[PDB]
Amino acid sequence: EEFDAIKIALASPDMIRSWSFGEVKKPETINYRTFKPERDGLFCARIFGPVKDYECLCGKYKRLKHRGVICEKCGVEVTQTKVRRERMGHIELASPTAHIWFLKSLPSRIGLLLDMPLRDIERVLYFESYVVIEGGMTNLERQQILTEEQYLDALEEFGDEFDAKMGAEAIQALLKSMDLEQECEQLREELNETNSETKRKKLTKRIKLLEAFVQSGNKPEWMILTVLPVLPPDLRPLVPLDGGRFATSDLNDLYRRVINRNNRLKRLLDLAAPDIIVRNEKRMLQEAVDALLDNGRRGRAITGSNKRPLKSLADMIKGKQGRFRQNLLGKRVDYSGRSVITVGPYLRLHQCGLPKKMALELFKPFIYGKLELRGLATTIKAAKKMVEREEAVVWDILDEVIREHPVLLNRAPTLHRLGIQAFEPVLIEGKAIQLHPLVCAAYNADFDGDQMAVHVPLTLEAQLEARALMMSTNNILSPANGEPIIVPSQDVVLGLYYMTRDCVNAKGEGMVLTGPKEAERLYRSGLASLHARVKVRITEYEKDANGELVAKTSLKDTTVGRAILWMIVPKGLPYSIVNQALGKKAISKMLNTCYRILGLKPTVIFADQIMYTGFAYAARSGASVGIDDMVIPEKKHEIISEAEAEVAEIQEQFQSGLVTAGERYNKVIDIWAAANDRVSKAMMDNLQTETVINRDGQEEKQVSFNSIYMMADSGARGSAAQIRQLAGMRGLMAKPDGSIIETPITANFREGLNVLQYFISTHGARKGLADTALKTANSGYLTRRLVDVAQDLVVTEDDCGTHEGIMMTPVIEGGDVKEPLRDRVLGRVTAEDVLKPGTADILVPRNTLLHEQWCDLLEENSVDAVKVRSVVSCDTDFGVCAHCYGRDLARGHIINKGEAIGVIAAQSIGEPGTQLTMSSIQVKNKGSIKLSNVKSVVNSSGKLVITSRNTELKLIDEFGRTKESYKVPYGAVLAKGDGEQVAGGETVANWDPHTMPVITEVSGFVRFTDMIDGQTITRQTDELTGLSSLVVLDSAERTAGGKDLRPALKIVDAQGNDVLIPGTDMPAQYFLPGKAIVQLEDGVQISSGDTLARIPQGLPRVADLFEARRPKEPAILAEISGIVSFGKETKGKRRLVITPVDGSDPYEEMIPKWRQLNVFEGERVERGDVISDGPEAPHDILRLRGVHAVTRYIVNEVQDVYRLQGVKINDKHIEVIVRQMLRKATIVNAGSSDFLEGEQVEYSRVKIANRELEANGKVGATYSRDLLGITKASLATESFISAASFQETTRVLTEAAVAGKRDELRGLKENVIVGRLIPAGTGYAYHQDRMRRRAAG
Template identity: 45%
Template sequence: MNEYRELKERWEDIFEADMGAEAILDILKRLDLNKMRAELLEEIASGSEQRKKKAMKALRVVEAFRRSGNKPEWMILRVLPVLPPDLRPMVQLEGGRFASSDLNDLYRRVINRNNRLKKLLEMEAPDIIIKNEKRMLQEAVDALIDNGRKARPLMNSQGNRLKSLSDLLRGKQGRFRQNLLGKRVDYSGRSVIVVGPELKLHECGLPKKMALELFKPFVIRRLIARGLAHSIRSAKRMVERARPEVWEILEEVVKDHPVLLNRAPTLHRLSIQAFMPRLIDSEAIQLHPLVCPAFNADFDGDQMAVHVPLSKAAIYEAKEYIMSTKNMLLPSSGEPIVAPTLDIVFGCYWLSLVRKGVKGEGRLFSSFDEVKLAYEFGEVDLHALVKVKAPWGEKIETTPGRIILNEALPEELRFVNDVVDKKKLKNLVAESYRLLGNERTAEMLDRIKELGYHYATLSGMSMSINDLEIPPEKKEYIEEAERELSKIERQYERGLITDEERYRRTVDLWDRVVKELTRKLEERLDPFSSIAMMANSGAKGNITQIRQMACMRGLMSDPSGKIIDMPIRSSLKEGLPVLEYFISTHGARKGLADTALRTSDSGYLTRRLIDVAHEVLVREEDCGTDEGIWIEEKKDALLPPFEERILGRIAQQDVVHDGEVIVRRGEEIDEEKAQRIKELGISRVYVRSPLTCRTHGGVCRLCYGRDIARRGLIRLREAVGIIAAQSIGEPGTQLTMRTFHTGGVAGYDITLGLPRVEELFEARVPKGQGYISDIDGVVKIENTKDGRKIRVISTHTYVDGYPIPEGYRIVVEDGKRVDAGDVLAVPEDGEKKPIKAKVSGTCEVEENRVYIRYEEKVEREYLVPLTTYVLVKDGQEVRAGDQLTEGPLNPHDILRIKGKEAVQRYLIVEIQKVYRSQGVSIHDKHIEVIIRQMMKCVRIDSPGDTEFLAGDLVARWEYEQTNARVLASGGGPATAHPV
């Protein structure tokens, strides 16, 4: 304030100071953008690096104003828009009081302060009062726009923060997500779902009451058309009274009219499917058991919504594209999603088992029918091995159960003479889909479903606690482990091993004990006991859960995911002591907390993926690119098999083996060709990929290849970006929810997985990053007090030549070392200047020439913590891009050192590892679509004669087009680097 007074006194005529938006408005009005642009360009050309950066930032804003035609002063609000009254309602309550939207309060404050300011200005009040009133008006406007920004927001009478305009738009309940992106739908209903085992795959059971309400207009129309009602009103009355003729007409209406079923959360396109309704008398919707995995539905109180497609086009699309029989494969991996589970798997497994020494074993039969007849008369046990002449003339050894099972399969898939578990059934569905299409596969699935349920019932499967037999060796193993443990503890107490080593050895010891006990349990387990059959068939549970029930629960994780080195020695059958029970609560509680927290994280990841990829459509047949990617066979258990990765791709080069062309360029690699490539031992194939597609704003059909959910080349206009985002996001949510079932038993957890996927897609610097070498060179490792110093030293030898003219005498000797500036030759007459060395090095003297051989060293230094595992040895030679220390790599480093293809490969492999480690399979193609979007921009280094600015982030195709245009007109192109 003193400074202000001092300046005002000294420069009264030319000095002016003001506060608030008015002062800023005045400054903005005086801005000359063209002059500003010229000054900034000058500063960029001549200023320091720091000033250059600042000037570039400012220039970007100036250019945006110049190009758009907007004026800077328009950025200051002078008129406040008022929200329509419907969006800020005022409601009268029962007691005669009014409940009003917070916005009315906020608007009222602005109006009151504005009117008071008007009055003060008319009264010509002192300057200080007017300034204060202007400040208060500014605060009222700020609160209206965003009341959450201030340290002390405006409160209502209850002490709650008033909701401002920003709050109305923000979040899930905000205007955008609640009202604009999602709307309430007419002709829809919701109800609890129950299982409908007798339904066909394309059917759902729809409660009659619900159907009547949903199809009301259709029923009314038919009632009037048939003369059963004379007006809409009388028809409505008939419907409300539910007359018998109404139900008849309803049956006719729904006969060929599909309905859409949806289960929230709608994570991918299979969460909405079309079914033909079958009217039922109950109040609940019946769902076919085989479509549950697609909806991620179970029958523990889940609800589903029903929607009626109204127009002819909508009905056609529902039948052709959304019908459950047309959506049997997962869009993410191409695997069957409609596959038998639970009871059906158990029934089929039990039916295909072989028992030794049962009735009728070894008997001979002349036909399958004869075997079935003998079984029906009780002459042969269902699981007895018999010899029978097959319809194709061969004599085979099989069981009556397997003959019955094969009758459910199409002719082309018979004869399956194996034990049929969940995996085998899934493979049969995939094979049937490939050979016979969806209609016949749906028929086969319905037959398998009925068979599975029937024989699961006949099996009499039940479970008793006595089925769980604790291995007698358990006590002996635990005592042995305790003796070993006391040795480890003694070594630790004497200081022979560190705490970390003690912990690791303890965990390894108990892990070994658990594995041994599991092996013993498996040996003792009766393969025909219900519990073993459930686990072995893949119907439910696994050996780990049986081990927890019968042997010991084993090692548990604490809330941070670290394994607790004190195992639970009791089994669930024996019961847990208090301390062990307490340890096991960690995992159970963490599972529940994770489910709540991580679900939102995964949903957010899906939304961000959709945001970047929604523009990617299949826009043309062929972009004409010559580029592609190499798909190589890698011996990594966490990566998809080689034949799976090349399947459905278009070859970019001929695939040749010993002169024979297996796949021609431009051909699709189908199942037979992929299998042939694998059998011939070809380990790398050059294929087209969305990563190298040159189509603007999307991809072309040939670069994308096969539509893995529908088999056959992808269709034009297909939204492959959305499919990719859903395919990556949906399992994320599944995984987050899956921790709920493991009960916290030590092992891999999605809490490592989901944040890692986010880290990769956002290309963040990873935690605990591994370092890679920037240059080729030799490694030198030194230990310092701060950590370990890894130096990579690159040495290059150069030779400088100095010609010695006549009249000069060489004064250095061959092999002698000289420094820069030393004299090499002197003139004999003394008038000319001597010849000096420009570099330091060793001399090589010839008759009239001196060479100086010198070395130039380039060095890079990396300081890593002592705990980090170093992958290279002292004195080892490394290449640029080689990994020096263990840990995830920074994608930006890979891009800078090894280039675009290397970073794309790294991201695909790392993302696949996260998902595959959780047993989720996603096709590389979807990850490639997202990575394409991640790398679609380049950063301008030098603008040349283009309109770009240095540092601008520009779409690659826009950069290439602009450069082509500038070159055609004889200008200089811009240069850029990928980001």
């Protein structure tokens, strides 16, 4: 069985000769009584193989007396009956025909080769016109079409000296004529002549085709076909039912029609007819052929009596009911079952309820072997009927076996890895699996009708895999982010909040105990309040010594509950930690810190006991919701009366006709929103602390004892808006239009809706519901795409010895920190030695793990930037090291190599999203201020104003780490300078949000030069004031006389000389586009910082983001540094006269100046400086920038997207899929291989790592790096089988076939589909054994 690799190829004719047993004949099947095959047809036993034991069709030859005899009555043979499925017959052809995939798909492969278009070839091969096989007289030409009548002209003209024909035969002759060599050298040559772009591309295309056929050895004449295989029956069967009424394939008629039409054809070739019918028949032939190959491709599709079209061969390989997705990747399985699911509250972590008969059914051969071992059921039939008796020993044995035999657990959707688990069995008297409740989380499951299913660890390898990997102890932190996933959900947390609580009210205040035990004596004797602060001693511990506990006791005035709750503490911990009412977040950090500090099991056991005590006390705690908990505040009516009077006033205004309707819309909607807010304040203050309870004092209040509020405060259920829904008016309503309604709701659920109000609720209700139904497909589609890219990657290595990657800095901008740079680093490994602001204090030797000792040790330090051996900066051929990744989250340690990184990345990423679609500047506080890469000016007011748009202001703290960062317009007006100290709450910045200022940093007289009324401009003289200038019109409105003359008001000295840009020799006057209208007159002065002019006025988003979708409106960038001016004057678009400092000027491109410009016609930029506005292209960024810019860009982008919904995932998940979007770099020079072609950046980095190495200095070729859209990148891959499995398979088949492709079974998909072990993780070891075996031969 065992084999190394696979290889595609064309089927040569002699290959079917080499596969064949017999040409076929008449198509009939059986005798309407004797339901038995006829011969040389479709179910002929003779050639595919025999049906029964050693019998001919009549029964003449049998018994092995006639061992090898073929029956001379029927020509029927003697053998076993398995070879049916390995053999294939064949059929010879009366004509030749061509294969369709080499025709009809994009680039033709055949006329492509020939430089003859398709429809030409059609018109030949629909048999409607002839065409020159060969210009015998070169008077006519090879590849020359000659109509049925023009052919005649040439015919009676010449006769002999041409070959000019029609049909597959002519094409055979031609392809058989043409050489590969001469064309190939001549193509390579005359490329040199004019390698114009489309031309050169086409040259390359055909050249490749040529040398491909050369080197594969595949032949073009074998494109044409004269023998065709045949399929065996049982893939196309014919089978009965009770009525003697059968069932058949979609296919058998295809062969039936085909063979019959051949029969007709040959029959009519015996007879020397006109070729008209010959044509008609053979067109029916090719019809039947290519419809077999693809029914519903070419013509009106073919149906039976069904009127459903008939399934092609191709269809069976294709879509989801294609093989790959239907029965090769997902599969029915033996030894499994399913169930409704209920809880086991009392259970332990490892345990799972198990309806015993399920295991009974499932653990059959175990106990049968066990009874032959015991011999009570000596034989097996005895075992069956004894099983059937229900002997108690059956169950004794079954408990005996089921011990330590672990099991699997499956809910659907198994969206991420934790949607299935593996527990130990425990049996139960019922048909209802129990489970440990807390893990509804990972399943997102609930006891409302959900279901689950099971699978069996038969092999011990699976047994142990299970027990070590999917034992629940293993996996309790998410691998995506570092939180526990066993958060105690709703009731437990609440009973907890009840206990650990501090009334003043109940009783028993200000006494002393030795420890919590006698408080239990009280409380279980029922003597003290439990949520009641009272003095007592404790004795806690701490491992302050080198992992050695530090014992001591002392007092606390603590609640009785908290005192008791200490009792479970495992011996490391303070009492301060247990000094509050323990928000759900609190419990999270509890379990966190326990695991962080001790290890797993104390936290485990702690957790179980916590669940248990929660059950106990929340059963004790007393809990109900009712109608008197539901309280509405009183001061609500007259607020609504105020609203009524005010809307009546605004009604009177709109009646009067002063105020408009949309104004009024915003007015009314805002004031209703304010009313809702006031009601919210009312109800919250009237509920949360509504409770006045007195202890040894007149009056005092504390947190409420109402059920509803404590449900809200625990985070178990409820929320302030939800309580508003039941109690208050809940906001307002958007109709399905997307509008928002003017009259919100008045009453609540407590009072009772209106007819209309609920009728109105309906709209947005159904809206959100259809969204509930219909956002998920996006997620699954997305998900399988993502993983389809990224399976191939697994850790290669431990250290790649590589060099620095990207820098790490926090994301605090807009407000405060949004990822602590602490948190950014977490588990990562440096790029380099790294020091402290106390300088020259290195702590990594270029790389260490960075654990919370380091994280806090350097949170002390005010360092705020570090670099890391990046995911992408890694350089291993075929994968990576482990260092460049760092730490396993869900473990909590550096990965040991050999595990799939892509899969968990996508499960991290796409799992959550299912839910997740659903002027001036003002300092807040005091601190230093930083503005860099800045050219600005002390304006005429005495403050800084920008001349370099790149600048943005920051609020730096007094230390130096930024508090805020905010953009600032070009030439905006400040009240402050850089690197100063200024009070919080101050509007430093100001600008008209419509102006785009034209500040003059030169100071000087102004004169009306270059510019004339109505010519380049208008002259508008303000009716308002009296002071104006020459008033510049827009692109269109100026009269075209001076629209080819860039208008420029001009600055000069007294002498009329242009005031140079001070310090530079560049003159300083402004070429004015529209809206830059100046306020001063001729002869007047501007100063430094003086405006001459003022210039007035989602989920699929992320789909576009990672797809590398490239927008419609680029905010384009400076291709190269140096000065620039504008280009040709708008034949559709204007252009851009580049002028480098020292390079070459000519590069210009179209500009829509209908979309605003940023730079002006005498203004300089640096390369990579933005020029237009809108969105931009990342492709340009990579084309211009390196890696870190764009990398950082999109990671920040989409992390902000999901962090809107408050969703936390680490970066490397993102960093890694990027490198799979860069599997290719396009070449620059040549000499190694061909000139440019997009080739593996990996293999590029090899050949340069060999060829530019001492092989040469360089023969080879520089390159540029290439992006690929994920869905195309996937396809654009070495392996084809993966590429055959998900999308656009057919063309992939062809493209592999043409070239003699040969896969090598490295990928996950590749080695799964073959039924081999993984080349990674578990079978990593075995596979690398195979690796160094092949190394070892």
